[model samples]
Target chain A: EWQENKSWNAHFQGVVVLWNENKQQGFTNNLKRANQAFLPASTFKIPNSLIALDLGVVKDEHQVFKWDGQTRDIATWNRDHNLITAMKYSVVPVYQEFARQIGEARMSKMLHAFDYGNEDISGNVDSFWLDGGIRISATEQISFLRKLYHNKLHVSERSQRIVKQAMLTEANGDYIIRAKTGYSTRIEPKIGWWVGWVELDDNVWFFAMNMDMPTSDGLGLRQAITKEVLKQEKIIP
Target chain B: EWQENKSWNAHFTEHKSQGVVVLWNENKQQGFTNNLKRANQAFLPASTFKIPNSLIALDLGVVKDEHQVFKWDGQTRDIATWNRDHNLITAMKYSVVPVYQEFARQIGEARMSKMLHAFDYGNESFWLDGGIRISATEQISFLRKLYHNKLHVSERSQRIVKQAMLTEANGDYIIRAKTGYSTRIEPKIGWWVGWVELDDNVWFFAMNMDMPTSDGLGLRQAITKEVLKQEKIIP
Candidate 1:
């Protein structure tokens, strides 16, 4: 019932993001899209960043996860980077190596503590949050953000704050749009994801729009669609 | 769409008013003394006099039931409305001036003046030419008395009038009003008057505006309904 105009429902499967300020009361166009679970993809980095920082595995914002000299799909991801840039670029190997470095038993505890993605980190640590090893739906996605926005996650407040800071995508006067995008190629011609919030002078709106990805250029679609929906809801100017 | 908060702005957004509203929520045991400054300034009751006019007709046995059909006496206004036979509900709802006009002739001047004066209508013409009216304050006071069956008419006549003016009932509540209008496009002469019964509580309200166009005619109901919605008194 959220989107009064259903012009956006062309082809999309799953997306669940809880918005803040409205207490998630604002809009819910596709309720089922939120409740159903799918691969976490790189949206997992939000928590991945928080967990790494909390465990002191990554010393601070500037600590680097150096390039392995192996180039991959996106040119921007090849350079050596730290926590902030790794997240901004969504460098998969960096987070994957951190996943391996963080190991399983403690990863299990952190996952359990945070109640993430069905609480299973059993199969392959490197690609579990990617290749269907771990799954979190749009519904779980928003609750995860709801906690972070209020600093309610069991992780340290600074740890949560630092991750949120690194994830900031835009800063307009008196308002900001904090966001993350994920494309799970595991389900190939994969499904895309967008999860974030728009902070206004007096309120914040959290949202998620997940759908069947159309093409490789579909990387930019989620944020565009989400921001458009936010504008329609008047959460953004 | 409707919202669950009270405001007088919408009705005045595209219009203005020399209106008053005295509302009572028997459930909450309080009232809205809104627009007191203007409500106290009385004007001609105009067509709103139909409320009492109908009661007099029913009380005097001029009309037996709500279904007491009034055949069109070769009127020349329209086919669907003015030329058709009208019952109590249809006449009140459409604000059929002709139907009420015919009632005025049947009830006669002396009897009409008695009822208007009895209810302290404040300003209604005695013989079918109603013009001046009650201020918002007197409007609410008179409605309050009538709501409790305190008018001079028989209890049955009172009940019948209340029911005749009935505009809506949605199981949860019943709403009735004897609304009226006059020219001026001035925003100060159109009337929106009514009472609502929800659960065990009853409330009364009166609003008048200068309405020249068709939309202006809607303010009374629009504003009152919004207020009731926001008050959580009615859906």
Candidate 2:
């Protein structure tokens, strides 16, 4: 049967792109939507972290990004955080600080080199990926993640390695999942994302999904729908 | 200020080799071949057979993934790379004959023949003997379909084999390719077939040369690269 025979259900209208690195192949829910670009929201942290570490903005994953002593919506953002904790919680202020240090000039040059979606970092450096004008398609997200999986991004090995380590969402004897969660509330029809790769046996399957969030209830569906599809495809046991 | 043949003729002439080249871009849907008539002539696919064999292997579950290892039978081969165990990637990289031969045997002729027809690869056999043959133009057609993921096989199968074909990647481009040499044939045939992914577009190229001596083996890639450079496909 074709990869598209599976059902994605109602209530969620979005796209998911699954690319297997070992097989050098991919399957998508909607080819049209998979190519449609949307604001990356926090998902941009994957590369933003790489830029930060490569530029010495953050000394290392262990180096702390001191809190501004200001509270935020997420309790995880209340205190100081290192690269790992910030990524685990997707702390906005921490990455915003990274973007501010990276600045527009370096950020634009680096994104151009990355060939990221649109390569448009037009708004404020710190907020461009958020309410600003940066966007990426699901397919592009898979390509960017594939580079990180292969350690081929134009960054130091140390930087890529540490960012990957920080992206760890789960680990087990059977599989290890390295991913990032992104939610863009600023845009109309808001979007939520869960993008990353799964290391199972000797193969790596990269997946990226973005769904419209009419309600915060849909937030969990990002990973929920993705994991279900992975199971159905027998990518994960 | 130049004709395509003149520029490409220089590439083959510089290498002192006799061959044909077919380069096509799926996006523009246009390209040039140095020797048009000869481009349609069929020859043994040789190691280039691995491309389809890999797809069949994955589809039939003959192998688990690119990392699936085929143990060395302790039978030493002439090529040093073949003397040890090889996974899908290593075997493709070294073009190990025994490993692919094993895949062919596992794939057998029925399914192999069936998939060959599905792929519409030139008049086919398993390349075990000289029964399977493909023209340079045919090679380009096959590669074009493979790159666009329009082949009959599963996207995963096509992808796994494509990854094994990767030869180079850098700031400007990524090249996925394979080289073929038929040592058994009387005026051996050497081939280099694959595609290059530039930032804006992808170009598929297929080249074959008559290998009368060991020196000609190196000319397979040398001539193709020179042609690509002459065409400014690569810097």
Candidate 3:
């Protein structure tokens, strides 16, 4: 049950679906090419959470972090945050601070373990946290989320649970749907983004959608496009 | 000639070279299922050069002072100088220097007229200076020299160059590098770069190439296996 949403760029796009325990296959409107990379946005927080756990930055899932309520002049700030709270709330500064504390060297090492997409998380961290830029790809997001389900990356069960729990959006029959939302804006040559993922009973999926708007206040465009896509894809009920 | 250097890895264990371009093509033997994205060592102008050129403007005593005329330090600083080098070179360090004045200085009508006769630089007033246009092949050569300090001769040039170089290395190479972006337009330019640190020598190089410029930054990266495979010195 899938249909094209007018909000998406119809010219250059494709979709792939699988059912029957993921043994089934699907089709696309256009010939699918090799998967290209895109910005991970808040989806990056999954790995960020795992890294924080692995690096011992946060000892337990219940660990509390007090948000100083510092305002991010350029972007909205989440007030009063802890590890899980910051993650659940999708606070930029909290994770930005965590990433800074983890530093590039350690962060790089942790990101390398997943081996899902390009290992250029160094540039990603620098741009997103330091320079206020976020990057990811649809394919990479799917791959990373799938790996988390399979436990292929050797991350601790505790870490996985932490990520899965934080990502939980809602619940359906025998299925747990977890998700996160991300939004970014660029002033000149306006651009906006929304990225996150979903975990089902036996399958998980990630998606990233972007909009090139006439103005910087494209947050409405970002939300509308993402919601429509998720509904069309049956990723959300 | 290419076969002599030909090698493939079927199991994706080690990186292998097929022809003159190392690690461009991948087989199972090189321990890669697909062509591993090698650091665009040879890819031209991957955008890191913009930062150094901007820094050099200050180091060269061209701008009165970095903070004065330029609003780079988050605020403006004022200073007096003998040489008024208010060119793109000074703002090149920040990569986003306001163009109006710098472009007027670096490529004046006289210089533009001279370049038009020598070569075909599409859109002469585009603000992209001639020296910056690069291809993958030229990038490798430029990097080789940059790592060896072959680009600069003066001590001040060397020090500023070294500092810029060191800052970008990130402990991976003996040299440093910074990536650049020109995403304001449609086809975004991507850059991957760093200087190499050998036993007794050092060099700097950068790569700036990509089809759709917006996501080029993610594409540009170090191909660890190939970088390790290449000999530091051709001794």
Candidate number achieving the greatest lDDT relative to the actual structure: 2
TM-score of each: 0.48, 0.54, 0.40
Better of 1 and 2 by DockQ: 2
What docking class should model 2 receive? incorrect
Model 1 CAPRI quality: incorrect
> How much is the lDDT of residue B4 in candidate 1?
24
Question: Local error of candidate 1 at B51, Å?
Answer: 69
Where is the poorest 10-residue window by lDDT in model 3 chain B? B24-33
Question: How would you encode candidate 1's per-residue C-alpha lDDT over B1-235 as one tens digit per residue?
Answer: 1112225545455355534455766556566744556657776666667677777888888877666778777857852666677777567666677788778788887787777788777864332233455676677777777777789987667666765565654335656776676554233466767787543357887776666565666677776676677667776
Candidate 1 stretches with Cα past 4 Å from truth are A1-26, B1-235
Candidate 3 residue spans exceeding 4 A from truth: A1-21, A24-34, A73-78, A121-135, A172-175, A184-208, A213-227, A230-237, B1-235
lDDT per residue as tens, model 2, B1-235: 1114645766777767677888886677886887777788998888898998999899899988876689999987788868988889778888888888888888898898989899999883347466888998899889888876689887678767876786765445667899998778655878999998764468899999878776778888778888888778899
- Off by more than 4 A, model 2: A1-237, B1-6, B124-128
Candidate 2 lDDT over residue span A1-237, tens digit each: 115533664324887789878678888777778888889998998999999999999887557777798778888788878887788778989898889889999999989888899999888888889888888999899889888877688988768777876776764345667899898888775889999998764578999999888788878888888888888789888
Highest DockQ, which number?
A: 2
Q: Write the per-residue lDDT of candidate 3 for residues B1-235, one digit (tens) a residue.
A: 0121223232123322211222221112121112223332222232454433433344445443322343333334332321233323233333444432453365455554453333222222233433334443344444444333344333334334433333322112333455555554434555555544432234333344443534323444433224334533222
lDDT of 1 by residue, A1-53 (tens): 24323444533344434455645464555666667787878898998888888
lDDT of 2: 0.82
